[PDB]
Write a protein that binds this DNA or RNA. Structure first.
Length: 49
DNA sequence: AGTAACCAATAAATGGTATTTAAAATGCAAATTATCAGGCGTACCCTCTTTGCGAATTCGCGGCAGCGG
């Protein structure tokens, strides 16, 4: 709290990180590593636009 | 334009028994580079809300249930 910021501002980053890291590790039968998941997500975001 | 198979002889006829030759080639296990795979962190503020809508008008049957003398 010494930083003087609202709690939610800090907490949201950790929550997003945890959720996304898990959805990368689990959720596939054959486990693609994290970095490849990031690259595939970039690929898909570029393809739509 | 000349008979011999006489008895020695000559080594050539083989395909078989091996310790060699070292060169090669052929494999073998290191060093040594690339690249992949994990972990951490992010400071304006954000606070039950999304769902399934229906393994979808079945039907007939059974029976284990709650209310009731």
């Amino acid at each position: 709290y010494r930083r003087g910021y609202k709690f939610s501002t800090y907490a949201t980053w950790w929550i997003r990180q945890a959720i996304t890291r898990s959805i990368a590790d689990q959720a596939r039968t054959i486990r693609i590593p994290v970095h490849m998941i990031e690259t595939i997500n970039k690929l898909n975001r570029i393809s739509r636009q």
